[PDB]
Design a protein around this ligand. Structure first.
Ligand code: HEM
Length: 147
């Protein structure tokens, strides 16, 4: 779970991460940099590479879903139940062999993309709160995936 102070930091900085595009730009950079750094991951997603137009499209949907998860952090069972449902759908996505291990490096590129957009606001406490928030959001998707 998250402490009240962590949910408050996540909720507050999400407003700047969302910007004017509901975080779409952050999603594009996240997935872009992740596949560039890990080339064998293009095949796990159904993409040709980091430049595939599907990267920008999926990047927007990933970040729009985190915005929904952020609006529900105060009710943990609610947030977990909807991320599990996202997770059950992932059984049939990409190469259909999405693994739990892949979410840990993806989380690192997500925090990097966020910091790229909001700069100094993504301080030490913001990074810890978001590493914790990403741990629970992705943790709940993985449990849907392995259900
Ligand atoms: C490295 C792990 C991941 C892989 C390989 C992956 C792969 C995919 C693929 C291939 C699709 C597109 C399916 C299609 O419509 O053709 C998809 C959709 C989606 N992914 Fe993931 N994904 C990953 C992580 C995440 C994370 C961390 C989130 C969390 C917010 C997420 C949220 C979504 C959402 C919201 C969709 C749109 C469709 C739906 O709601 O099920 N994905 N993902």
């Amino acid at each position: 779970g998250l402490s009240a102070a962590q949910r408050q930091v996540v909720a507050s900085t999400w407003k700047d991460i969302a910007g004017a595009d509901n975080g779409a730009g952050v999603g594009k950079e996240c997935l872009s940099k992740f596949i560039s750094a890990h080339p064998e991951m293009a095949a796990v997603f159904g993409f040709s590479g980091a430049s595939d137009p599907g990267v920008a499209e999926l990047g927007a949907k990933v970040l729009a879903q985190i915005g929904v998860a952020v609006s529900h952090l105060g009710d943990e069972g609610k947030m977990v139940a909807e991320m599990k449902a996202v997770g059950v759908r992932h059984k049939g996505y990409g190469n259909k062999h999405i693994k739990a291990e892949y979410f840990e490096p993806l989380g690192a590129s997500l925090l990097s993309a966020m910091e790229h957009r909001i700069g100094g606001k993504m301080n030490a406490a913001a990074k810890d709160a978001w590493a914790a928030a990403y741990g629970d959001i992705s943790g709940a998707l993985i449990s849907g995936l392995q259900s």
